[PDB]
């Protein structure tokens, strides 16, 4: 120290390389949102499991051709039919109903005309089939959508709603997944007060713990609030021990120098980097600690509030994604057009922005937060602008030029 400056590329790769993948556990399928499957999932039945009608109509023998037919009955959703359709008969079907024995096609109701109904008008008796059915027409055969024994979801699948629905479909209600990381957050600094406190001299309200907790929660991971910790070895070492004991990940912000000393000397953690050649984020620190053959990760983020949130999105979120089993945990980076000119720094530079798609324009505009219309000054950040380092060729970027933006919010 001052620790060597690490490049942004090496810092990032080092985070992903060194972060572990959590172990697995069995969950109920309804809790599967955002989880990664740690098993292949197979169907144990056919979908549909019976030949099913695609249409409201009549189940027929295609060989009978067009003509006048006795309706022997009705097949409806949820009931197995007990009658066999013989030559010159048909059975009424609704969409999804099983096809009875002896019928090999369905003619939709619009290709028919009813001849006779019961006196009370509740019951159709005879119908004119107006078309020549193709065999198997308007029937979903057994197993058309899913076959028994088929693998419907592969291990490594990152599950959303449709995958939860596929589990339900196949009746696989308990599944093996990766664990979610438990994330403990503390703040440090003698100047900090709880949000709930009135100001005292020399002090400000701690906002990072709140912003960082919210960031992590927005991604779905459980969190632990470790509060404000006195910026001294004794309280830092204890907070850090309580974090290590309670969580997979510990994030601190502030005091980055007692912090880096406790990690190395008192905790015996390997600090992989302590300064990053980036803007903002220069003092960011990443360390791992192996105890139990369990690897803990520790992020010591800058105290400055803008820096704490940018660094959390660049480093922490991808690490958590890896921990929870996502095979490629890297963030989504899209192309956008700058809304304003911008001088480049020699450091790679990151800034919160709002992404907006205008009428029939293929690229969204990226508007840097804090400088704003009314409605635009009100909007929440959904991107992180990723500005290139200054060069001899590129010293300045202009409104309208094409830039990289990391997606950090719902679009």
């Amino acid at each position: 120290s001052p620790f060597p400056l690490t490049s942004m590329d090496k810092a990032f790769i080092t985070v992903l390389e060194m972060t572990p993948v959590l172990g697995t556990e069995i969950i109920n399928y309804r809790d599967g949102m955002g989880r990664v499957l740690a098993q292949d999932v197979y169907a144990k039945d056919n979908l549909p499991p019976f030949p099913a009608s695609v249409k409201d109509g009549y189940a027929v023998r295609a060989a009978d051709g067009p003509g006048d037919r006795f309706i022997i009955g009705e097949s409806q959703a949820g009931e197995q039919p007990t009658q066999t359709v013989m030559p010159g008969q048909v059975m009424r079907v609704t969409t999804g109903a099983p096809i009875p024995c002896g019928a090999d096609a369905v003619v939709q109701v619009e290709d028919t005309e009813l001849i006779r109904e019961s006196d009370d008008g509740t019951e159709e008796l005879e119908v004119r089939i107006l078309v020549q059915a193709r065999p198997g027409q308007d029937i979903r055969p057994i197993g058309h959508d899913i076959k028994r024994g088929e693998c419907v979801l592969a291990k490594g699948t990152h599950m959303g709603p449709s995958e939860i629905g596929l589990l339900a479909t196949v009746g696989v209600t308990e599944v093996e997944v990766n664990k979610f990381p438990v994330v403990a957050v503390m703040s440090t600094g003698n100047e900090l007060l709880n949000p709930e406190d009135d100001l005292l001299p020399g002090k400000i309200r701690d906002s990072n713990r709140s912003t960082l907790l919210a960031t992590i929660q927005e991604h779905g991971y459980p969190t632990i609030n470790l509060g404000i910790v006195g910026d001294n070895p004794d309280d830092l070492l204890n907070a850090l021990n309580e974090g290590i004991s309670r969580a997979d990940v510990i994030i601190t912000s502030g005091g980055v120098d007692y912090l880096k000393q406790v990690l190395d000397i008192d905790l015996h953690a390997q600090i992989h980097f302590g300064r990053v050649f980036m803007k903002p984020g220069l003092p960011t620190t990443f360390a791992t600690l192996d105890i139990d053959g369990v690897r803990k990760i520790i992020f010591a983020l800058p105290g400055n509030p803008v820096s704490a949130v940018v660094t959390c999105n660049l480093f922490v979120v991808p690490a958590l994604r890896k921990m929870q089993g996502i095979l490629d945990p890297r963030p989504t980076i899209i192309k956008a057009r700058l809304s304003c000119d911008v001088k480049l720094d020699p450091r790679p530079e990151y800034h919160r922005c709002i992404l907006t798609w205008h009428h029939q324009e293929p690229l969204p505009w990226a508007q840097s937060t804090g400088n704003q219309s009314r409605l635009m000054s009100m909007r929440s950040a959904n991107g992180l602008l990723m500005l290139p380092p200054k060069t001899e060729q590129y010293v300045e970027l202009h409104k309208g030029e094409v830039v990289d933006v990391m997606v950090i919010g719902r679009l």
């Binding site: 942004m8 790679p348 990723m386 290139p388 094409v402 830039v403």
Partner: peptide, 10 residues
């Protein structure tokens, strides 16, 4: 994919 912003070749 690069964590460090690039400029646009086109």
């Amino acid at each position: 994919f690069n964590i460090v912003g690039t400029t646009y070749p086109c």
